[PDB]
Design a protein around this ligand. Structure first.
Ligand SMILES: C/C1=C\[C@H](C)C[C@H](C)OC(=O)C[C@H](c2ccc(O)cc2)NC(=O)[C@@H](Cc2c(Br)[nH]c3ccccc23)N(C)C(=O)[C@H](C)NC(=O)[C@@H](C)C1
Ligand SMILES: C/C1=C\[C@H](C)C[C@H](C)OC(=O)C[C@H](c2ccc(O)cc2)NC(=O)[C@@H](Cc2c(Br)[nH]c3ccccc23)N(C)C(=O)[C@H](C)NC(=O)[C@@H](C)C1
Ligand SMILES: C/C1=C\[C@H](C)C[C@H](C)OC(=O)C[C@H](c2ccc(O)cc2)NC(=O)[C@@H](Cc2c(Br)[nH]c3ccccc23)N(C)C(=O)[C@H](C)NC(=O)[C@@H](C)C1
Ligand SMILES: Nc1ncnc2c1ncn2[C@@H]1O[C@H](COP(=O)(O)OP(=O)(O)O)[C@@H](O)[C@H]1O
Ligand SMILES: Nc1ncnc2c1ncn2[C@@H]1O[C@H](COP(=O)(O)OP(=O)(O)O)[C@@H](O)[C@H]1O
Ligand SMILES: Nc1ncnc2c1ncn2[C@@H]1O[C@H](COP(=O)(O)OP(=O)(O)O)[C@@H](O)[C@H]1O
Ligand SMILES: [Mg+2]
Ligand SMILES: [Mg+2]
Ligand SMILES: [Mg+2]
Lengths: 72, 371, 371, 371
């Protein structure tokens, strides 16, 4: 998940929707611990140690980006 | 729990909750696949698109309509379109809500068998029913008597009804359509030098047919008028910004409904099949059928089709007998509005097929209960 | 391990590590041999020179470009240039790093076969891929839709792409070039009395073309202006300190891209091949192609080529349709920057050709995997 | 007086007198202009060349085809080609003889209007008619029933006919062509390292396509065979005496007719459009259409296209229903032979458009009388 989020940061016209679509392509039925909420396409579920947790995609790419321009 | 009401067709899908005033999800019913080699890496390339997505991307795609002539002709794409309708576009789980489904009359039985089998097995819908389009048009227009004429993409059909009883022997069906009007529009448009070959071009032709066609009140007089003068001739802007000018043809296109001989069929036009359907009814009711003609579905939206119909029936019908055509402006949606009204009724709640009754009888039950 | 990213061409070689912001090694791609009898003893005479060395010595040397028109036309000199690239100029052993290589589209297949065979057998690179220049320009400019126009020394080519799918039938290739602009510059320069015959003189002509040429916005108006006035006329200093003065010719030289009839070809200029490539695309995408035109490679560096292109396409294109030309200042390197971005992506790591797959399938695998 | 019979197309012009067994004048339909500066004085420099002259000189010339896709797209060059046809190459004044002209179906009306206007006004032909190519193929092959498939340079079209009545709704048209097969042949030939850029090179590619291409009976089996073995690989001698070797590609080129997806279109191949055209016919005739398939025009000359068509239709058509393909060796000329037969008939003499009827009705008469 983190490595696809980092790829989506740099890839042009990146978005949270195309990230989520990459999640579903990569994991949706290959890993028992990753799950998609049935009624939505903007979220994913990780079975943690304690509990399942829905994570919303809407924040992720806006928050993940850092690049600090050296001249500044 | 509010039942879902879903109306499939060739062309648009219309879906929403019962008791709503208007459908919540409307989108053209298309499944599209890419036909070019995806060159960029990591794009997130997707197997196929549905509805509005397939419309936006369409330049990349082959567009295939999974229903031709009201028959579902590949069940995988249709099941994709329902999956998109419930989960993506209404965002409501089918395991909560009864569902109501809509079909053209005199269709094959297997279409209902498969449609119920997919609803119970593949979506686990707790209850379902299948209504006739024409019956629902009467609920929408607020009547219990009349001869319905309903024409969409795909099927055109007349169903006479008198105080809530159908007259099965008088039901008529015809395969003139928005679609065959579109293919005729392409084949005639070729005359002026414009060639629309691919499916995504056909969608442009469809938009030309919606925006610019109109039903000539008198055919040969407007033919002579268009030969004499530019005044009838009007122009449209293709997506790339080129302009095309179309002439007499724009009235020539929707008349084929009245004269199927243009597209090459022999069965008479919607006026004469309306008259012949009334004539197949017993003589006492016929006054009330002439008093009510209810139009439905998009192919009856053309400007002037109401007056051309009223005139040409009045020419067919006995001179004393008052002919009236009832064309409500909303009529593109009236089959859905009627389905909403029906599904809301309390008396109807008796009449759903329930999952237990399906498990007992198997998918043939639909013929027994529904119609 | 960071993959290498290497972009060969006629003219400069550009190489560096993936994920860098700009290429670490840039040098003109030349192999040079001495043509004079070495008189001194113990000089340290060397069999042949590569790159910047051949540039410095060049007065002594025959300079040969091992790639003309994007095709490798003697494999020994090309293998020398790769040897210099990996060992001398990047100083990194190829047995550690995947490598990414770049080619113009619609090249012969044998060029990819030989290039992969030499990478696996002669450098033992653990994995390699071959990308299209135009595709990489889209990664660099930050887009997934547009028609790329990319022109270096050797090949000029347009590749339209729409949401990550190429349109192979619409790909155009042309052999106007920095090089044929150079040979035209020599043949026209003769008019004013200056004759640059040898290859090391051609390098001077190339430096004149870089420093002083500019694309006339309107050709005949600037021809009349240069006939009327000195004001357009500008001068340059040969290595020996002589001065030369060049006139109207300095704008006459880069226009041949727009009018190949000057050099003697008949195929229309880069504007009309851009338009013809868009026209070979289906009508729905064309708005987005006109919205994005991406220039790439050094031959698009001339002052005013962006505005001359925008004007002349707008004259070709339907009047309503907004035409935009996207000429980023970096565009000389954008094929490398795009290769760096692509090689950095995590999804791509699936997509390298690996040495095992080569040993199993032989060098023909490149056609299967790469494009 | 013997009427002239003239059959225009993209590619060859075929003209001769009615009642002759074979056309008297056949020459490729090209207008050519010089593109080099004439240096010699008193050469007799000529504004432009037509037909065989433009072929012989062609290395000096830009060659322009005045008909693309069966549409006349610049009327001056077309009028030159008619001038050359009547005066230079038949040497007979048009003011003596009725003329018969030939067109692909479903063309724009303006093409017939202008062609008649130029015949009456500019050549003063006493009478003229315009026939459909497919109809004439049936006269040539000696039948009054069948589905014609006729493919030349430019248009490919199917026209079903049953006992002398056409079935307009079942007419199909496609823009696969000898010409698009040629452009595909150039674009694929590039793979092996051979680049044919200019129009006079395109004429070489056309001659390669004529001499060496053949339709693979089973595509993937011959692809594997050509990958495995040289035995399929054959070589040709360019005009300058260089040799080129072409491999699997020579069968790869004509299959695109069967799989337009190679050139990038989506509409199915000539077999599936033939089947779909039969299916658009009413169910009683279909046996007789399957019994007769008539091929016409040069693009159906490829070795094995007859057997590949018969096999692939038999695979599409119901197994009992006898499929027959009728490919006469003369079929390149059969549209002319049919025009000769028709023009010779006595009943036809009623049916010419006469000059008086043109003066009365204007050039629109052609739509009324001809079809
Ligand atoms: C050769 C013939 C029939 C067929 C090709 C023979 C095959 C064997 O019948 C099938 O079983 C296939 C299929 C079919 C599809 C789904 C299904 O659950 C059951 C059957 N039904 C069809 O293709 C229908 C569809 C249809 C049109 Br549109 N409107 C209609 C109105 C009411 C009912 C159905 C339809 N169709 C196009 C035809 O019949 C055509 C007009 N029929 C003929 O030309 C005659 C000469 C007989
Ligand atoms: C943008 C569009 C149209 C045009 C560019 C819009 C312009 C405005 O139309 C014209 O009026 C010009 C002209 C034309 C030429 C001569 C003439 O006496 C009348 C018109 N006709 C043409 O360029 C034809 C020629 C043609 C091909 Br090949 N087969 C065909 C089959 C039947 C008829 C004609 C043809 N042509 C190439 C096209 O339509 C292309 C395929 N059309 C399209 O992509 C769609 C999306 C609409
Ligand atoms: C006489 C002809 C061909 C040749 C001389 C005949 C010989 C026999 O072909 C070869 O096999 C040699 C070779 C070649 C080189 C390396 C290789 O792994 C395979 C072949 N290819 C070449 O010399 C190419 C290179 C090239 C230019 Br630049 N852009 C191109 C675009 C696409 C592809 C290739 C190219 N080249 C210069 C030509 O074709 C010239 C333009 N062709 C012609 O004038 C016509 C009339 C046909
Ligand atoms: N304003 C309009 N004028 C003419 N035709 C229309 C108009 N709107 C829609 N259509 C055509 O009517 C058909 C759609 O009819 P509709 O009844 O909405 O389909 P459905 O049967 O799926 O409900 C299509 O062919 C569409 O192009
Ligand atoms: N500032 C400039 N103005 C015009 N032409 C230039 C300029 N800089 C380089 N060129 C020319 O562009 C060509 C190099 O293009 P480039 O894309 O860098 O080569 P490559 O294809 O190897 O990357 C050479 O002909 C060079 O002379
Ligand atoms: N024996 C052949 N095999 C394959 N293609 C051929 C053959 N002879 C001619 N052609 C091609 O067919 C086209 C000419 O078709 P034709 O029908 O004769 O032209 P027109 O439409 O002018 O009558 C040209 O592309 C020509 O190169
Ligand atoms: Mg409807
Ligand atoms: Mg480059
Ligand atoms: Mg022909």
């Amino acid at each position: 998940v983190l490595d696809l989020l980092d790829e989506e940061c740099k890839m042009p016209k990146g978005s949270d929707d195309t990230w989520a679509q990459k999640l579903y392509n990569t994991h949706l039925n290959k890993c028992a611990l990753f799950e998609k909420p049935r009624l939505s396409n903007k979220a994913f579920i990780i079975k943690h140690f304690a509990d399942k947790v829905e994570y919303q995609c809407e924040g992720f790419l806006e928050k993940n980006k850092d690049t600090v321009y050296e001249e500044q | 729990t509010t039942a879902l009401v879903c109306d499939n067709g060739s062309g648009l899908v219309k879906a929403g909750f019962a008791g709503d005033d208007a459908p919540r999800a409307v989108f053209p019913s298309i499944v599209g696949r890419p036909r070019h080699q995806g060159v960029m890496v990591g794009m997130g390339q997707k197997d196929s698109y549905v509805g509005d997505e397939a419309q936006s991307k369409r330049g990349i795609l082959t567009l295939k309509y999974p229903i031709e002539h009201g028959i579902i002709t590949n069940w995988d794409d249709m099941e994709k379109i329902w999956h998109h309708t419930f989960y993506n576009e209404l965002r409501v789980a089918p395991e909560e809500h009864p569902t109501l489904l809509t079909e053209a009359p005199l269709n094959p039985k297997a279409n209902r068998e498969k449609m119920t089998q997919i609803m119970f097995e593949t979506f686990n819908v707790p209850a379902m029913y299948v209504a006739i389009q024409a019956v629902l048009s009467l609920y929408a227009s607020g009547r219990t008597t009349g001869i319905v004429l309903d024409s969409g993409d795909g099927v055109t059909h007349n169903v006479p009804i008198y105080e809530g009883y159908a007259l099965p022997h008088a039901i008529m069906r015809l395969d003139l359509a928005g679609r065959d009007l579109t293919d005729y529009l392409m084949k005639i448009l070729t005359e002026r030098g414009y060639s629309f070959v691919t499916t995504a071009e056909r969608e442009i032709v469809r938009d030309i047919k919606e925006k610019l066609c109109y039903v000539a009140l008198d055919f040969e007089n407007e033919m002579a008028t268009a030969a004499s003068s530019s005044s009838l001739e009007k122009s449209y802007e293709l997506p790339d910004g080129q302009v095309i000018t179309i002439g007499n043809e724009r009235f020539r296109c929707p008349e084929t409904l009245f004269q199927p001989s243009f597209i090459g069929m022999e069965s008479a036009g919607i006026h004469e099949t309306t008259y012949n359907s009334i004539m197949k009814c017993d003589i006492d009711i016929r006054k009330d059928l002439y008093a009510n003609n209810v139009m439905s579905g998009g192919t009856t939206m053309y400007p002037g089709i109401a007056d051309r119909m009223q005139k040409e029936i009045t020419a067919l019908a006995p001179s004393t007998m008052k002919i009236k055509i009832i064309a409500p402006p909303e009529r593109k949606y009236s089959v859905w509005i009627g389905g909403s009204i029906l599904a809301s009724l309390s008396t109807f709640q008796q009449m759903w097929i329930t999952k237990q009754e399906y498990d007992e009888a198997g998918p043939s039950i639909v013929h027994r209960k529904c119609f």
